[PDB]
Amino acid sequence: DLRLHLLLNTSVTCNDGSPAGYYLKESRGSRRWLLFLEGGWYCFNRENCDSRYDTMRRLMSSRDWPRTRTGTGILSSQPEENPYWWNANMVFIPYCSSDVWSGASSKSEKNEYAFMGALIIQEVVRELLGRGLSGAKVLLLAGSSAGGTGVLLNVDRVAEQLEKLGYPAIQVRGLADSGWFLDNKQYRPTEAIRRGIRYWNGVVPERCRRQFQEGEEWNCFFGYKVYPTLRSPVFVVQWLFDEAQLTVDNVHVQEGLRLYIQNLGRELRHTLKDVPASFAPACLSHEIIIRSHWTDVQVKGTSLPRALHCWDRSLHKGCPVHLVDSCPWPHCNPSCPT
Numbered sequence: 421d422l423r424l425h426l427l428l429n430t431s432v433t434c435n436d437g438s439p440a441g442y443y444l445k446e447s448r449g450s451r452r453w454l455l456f457l458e459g460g461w462y463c464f465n466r467e468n469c470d471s472r473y474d475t476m477r478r479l480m481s482s483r484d485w486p487r488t489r490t491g492t493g494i495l496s497s498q499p500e501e502n503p504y505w506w507n508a509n510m511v512f513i514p515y516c517s518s519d520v521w522s523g524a525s526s527k528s529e530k531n532e533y534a535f536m537g538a539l540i541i542q543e544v545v546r547e548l549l550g551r552g553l554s555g556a557k558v559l560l561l562a563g564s565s566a567g568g569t570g571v572l573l574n575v576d577r578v579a580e581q582l583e584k585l586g587y588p589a590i591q592v593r594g595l596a597d598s599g600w601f602l603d604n605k606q607y608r609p610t611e612a613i614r615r616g617i618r619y620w621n622g623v624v625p626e627r628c629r630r631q632f633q634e635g636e637e638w639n640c641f642f643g644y645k646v647y648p649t650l651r652s653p654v655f656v657v658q659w660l661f662d663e664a665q666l667t668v669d670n671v672h673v674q675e676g677l678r679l680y681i682q683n684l685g686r687e688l689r690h691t692l693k694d695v696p697a698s699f700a701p702a703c704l705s706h707e708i709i710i711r712s713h714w715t716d717v718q719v720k721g722t723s724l725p726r727a728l729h730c731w732d733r734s735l736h737k738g739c740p741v742h743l744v745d746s747c748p749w750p751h752c753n754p755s756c757p758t
């Protein structure tokens with residue numbers, strides 16, 4: 421179990437003004453820290469956020485959060501369930517800012533909601549240093565779905581923040597799960613992101629922002645555009661046929677749909693050709709790293725926990741780190757989730 425702590429700085433809030441927070445399980449004999457970002461889409465204007473507040477309030481408020489949560493998958497402390505990092509200090513950061521972890525705007529007389537996702541990550545890092553993070557060797561910022569996109573938007577800022585607080589020895593890395601999307605043609609979204617960044621006062625990594633400049637920062641929400649600009653090491657986990665991608669493509673089998681789906685897999689494979697640390701199975705699914713059975717999927721004979729260990733070795737023969745399926749249809753990999 422991971423135990424809840426609400427932020428001592430009460431000006432860093434969820435959408436409705438209640439304090440943000442984090443769940444923590446310490447491991448006193450470890451110098452490794454894992455901070456995981458939850459996903460769950462976003463909202464981009466008043467009416468759209470009002471509807472989310474009616475039916476998805478735990479994604480907008482901490483008032484009903486439970487005091488504990490069970491760590492699963494990469495957040496499990498059990499070696500059998502988590503061969504990679506079972507002995508690490510575990511942190512789960514709930515998503516309550518509805519801004520893909522990009523916002524930096526307070527609630528005020530002019531703002532019905534607060535969008536502080538980027539400030540929430542930095543405040544969790546600040547408060548954790550006094551709970552042992554100051555003696556860390558590696559900080560892995562991971563996340564799934566919008567939390568995976570949030571890793572791409574925030575990993576370099578976490579490193580810059582510790583670099584100037586006097587901790588140049590902590591190695592910051594990123595693990596982005598199911599957050600790597602294509603801005604392709606629909607079979608039958610970018611505007612919603614463009615409006616959301618304005619509503620949120622959203623921020624994107626500095627070099628990417630300088631490439632695309634004012635009004636075009638929405639480009640930095642797409643992995644193949646922002647990843648080339650990043651300085652920190654980032655491991656990319658991505659189903660070739662992500663359910664969230666098919667949703668924004670209005671896909672719910674004739675020749676037309678067949679060619680559409682095969683072209684989607686081929687294009688995603690191509691965007692990963694120059695990503696040296698990556699795991700991309702040919703499956704139709706959604707998320708992986710916090711699932712209890714994340715140890716079961718394999719690409720070219722190698723599991724994800726093994727690939728991540730090989731990544732660790734490469735940063736310190738038969739230990740690969742670039743694993744991308746080449747077969748062209750969902751479930752051509754026999755280890756896909758059922």
Ligand SMILES: *[C@@H]1O[C@H](CO)[C@@H](O)[C@H](O)[C@H]1NC(C)=O
Binds near residue numbers: 429431432539543
């Ligand atoms: C609390 O957080 C806000 C938002 O990041 C920041 O402006 C302020 O300086 C913080 N105050 C303290 C005492 O940490």
Ligand SMILES: COC(=O)COc1ccc(C#N)cc1
Binds near residue numbers: 520613
């Ligand atoms: C969020 O969790 C999910 O359910 C699907 O993943 C997403 C959705 C939207 C965005 C953006 N911008 C990034 C990732």
